[PDB]
Amino acid sequence: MYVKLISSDGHEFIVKREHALTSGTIKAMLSGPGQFAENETNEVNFREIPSHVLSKVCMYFTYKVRYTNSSTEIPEFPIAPEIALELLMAANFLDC
Amino acid sequence: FLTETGEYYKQEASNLLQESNCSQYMEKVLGRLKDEEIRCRKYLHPSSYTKVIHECQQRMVADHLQFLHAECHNIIRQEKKNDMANMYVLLRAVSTGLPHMIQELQN
């Protein structure tokens, strides 16, 4: 299943749902009266997360679902100094 | 609820013995024990499925254990196959149940 993530730039960020449920609030956003049980779009809009940070959090979703159990080498996540501050705030907001 | 179930089934057991012998009483109790199992399943929490039945069995069998044991002799010595099946499943529930019936059947 695929869910959409909308930034403040309008960038849709379609991500497989099982990877996108690692963050707590995206699980919470799709819960309650935001389920929309028709399986047509299944989108959540972030009014205060820029696109250059949703890209990083989606890359982290894929990275974490890939390396959740492979405790072999666990390669480091590449975080630029420019992206470092807003990425922390986004992970805090999403409980990522 | 268990105090209400205990009181209500004590009243039911007292009512049944006034107008029934030892053969029809077991059939009615097994009907009530089956019905109480059904109506304590679609009403109560699954953790209390056995406490209501246990309280139901004590009031309708264990309290009237003397009545069931007194007619065990006539039930067994006449080879009543239908009544022995009802008494066995009844007396198996209570603690001081089956032994005397065993001591009857062997005899």
Binding site: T68, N69, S71 | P46, S47, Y49, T50
Partner: protein
Amino acid sequence: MEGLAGYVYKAASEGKVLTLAALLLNRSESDIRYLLGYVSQQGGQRSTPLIIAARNGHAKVVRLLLEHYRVQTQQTGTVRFDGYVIDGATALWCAAGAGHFEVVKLLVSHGANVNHTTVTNSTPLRAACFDGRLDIVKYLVENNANISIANKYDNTCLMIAAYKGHTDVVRYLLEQRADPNAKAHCGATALHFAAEAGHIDIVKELIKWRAAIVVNGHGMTPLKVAAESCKADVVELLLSHADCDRRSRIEALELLGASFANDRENYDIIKTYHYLYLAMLERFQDGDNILEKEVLPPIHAYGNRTECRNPQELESIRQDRDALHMEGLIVRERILGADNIDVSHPIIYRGAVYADNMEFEQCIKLWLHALHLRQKGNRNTHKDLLRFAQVFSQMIHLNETVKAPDIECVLRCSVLEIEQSMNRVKNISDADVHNAMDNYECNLYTFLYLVCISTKTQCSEEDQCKINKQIYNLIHLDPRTREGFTLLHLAVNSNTPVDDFHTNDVCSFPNALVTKLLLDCGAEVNAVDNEGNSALHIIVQYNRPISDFLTLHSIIISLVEAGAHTDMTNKQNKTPLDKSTTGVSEILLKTQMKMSLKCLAARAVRANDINYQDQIPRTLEEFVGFH
């Protein structure tokens, strides 16, 4: 000269007359016989060049091979596939099976055996009418073909022709004085086959031929088979035969209405009600000679409704589909005796439809009745248990409390079916040993899913006691998968497959609760497969030791504290620490490894190969074999 024979075979198969003539040019009689007559293997088929030419219907190749080379038309080979491994069939049989009139004519003119018999006594006329060509059948019959020749199951050419919807061949066979009262292996005649095939014209031709209606070996009339086939027009033509008396026709009408009451493609309320109304009127009209049906006592699985004796009872339930389905099921199992092959399948379909819209309990009881009927019929129910565990998996996924006595009865059905598959694979030979083993593995996996969903539910003390008693019974049965996997090995293996339905949402392996329940029921913790791995070597290779570390640690401690030997050595001299491939499992097991002098001494004895036979206690000999 196998290469030249293969080239000739390829030329005959492809129909290249020029290539065949070039390869057969300047060949002696011995070379001609070797090139024309050799059996070649291709595509799982053993065939001669003439046989493979006749199968593809190459008239030119056949006439070239038979006019000059005078090849004998008695070649043997394996023809066709998909349940047909018939051997010894000549070119005429291949040409008749593929419906090639010219090849059959050429072979007959050249002198082929019209009455040739294959391994399963298959006349070429039987294959000719199997394909559906009248000209071939007529030519063979005019060339002295015996229709009465049948196979070991006694299926004549009329029956194999009546299986399909070809009126002309069966009509010509009837015109050639075919015996209509011939009996198949299970007491069946061509009338039953025509009735189940749903061809009104074949049935009317047979009854004009005075088919001499007789029941089958199982005990049903062909009219009953027609009723079971949901074929209204086939049933509504035998009333003119004036031989069904009154009971047979009314019971056939009731059976046809019952078949109308539940079918995957022939389900309709209005027609079923109309047919049941007609049957009720025909039964209640005369009054003096009224036919009273014997009503069975009310089955709990058959709801709480005991038939519909009153006409107004049937009239009032005209607006309810469920009562119509129930009465149709009851009359169907009453007429068929609840011991026929096609009794349970409509029950299963009705249950599936009833379950497709969140309705559960009546589905469960109909499926229970179908399971009981199939068990009394000695029929495997692996698919039934699989779909039923799927239904409970969907129930648990939708936070619905599954009723526990249903789980008890279904688990007892599962262990009964597993025992049946056990003694089946004990008695079944190599013919279908693979299929029997596959059904056995399916039964094992379904039981595992049922155990998982049982552990995902909450029940009473006595209910859990009964469930664990049944699991104890199956454990003492000691099942064994084809790889030697015991009941415990599969519960801890992540390689145990789970079907694509909702069972993936609940029944995920390895499961801590399933393994704990198996160990509480006295599972053989030190059981060894044919590979050699114990119940502990299998788990420690788990590839997800961190995300679900709880269900790894729980199974490890449950195994170790019960009876597991942590140092047990498999057939490849591998300690469970050696077969770990994971630091988490390795050190988690090391936290449970109580070192013993007995194990160190056993390792020292095994390593240097001391002859320990009869010099130690017998329990130590298998202990040394452990290490």
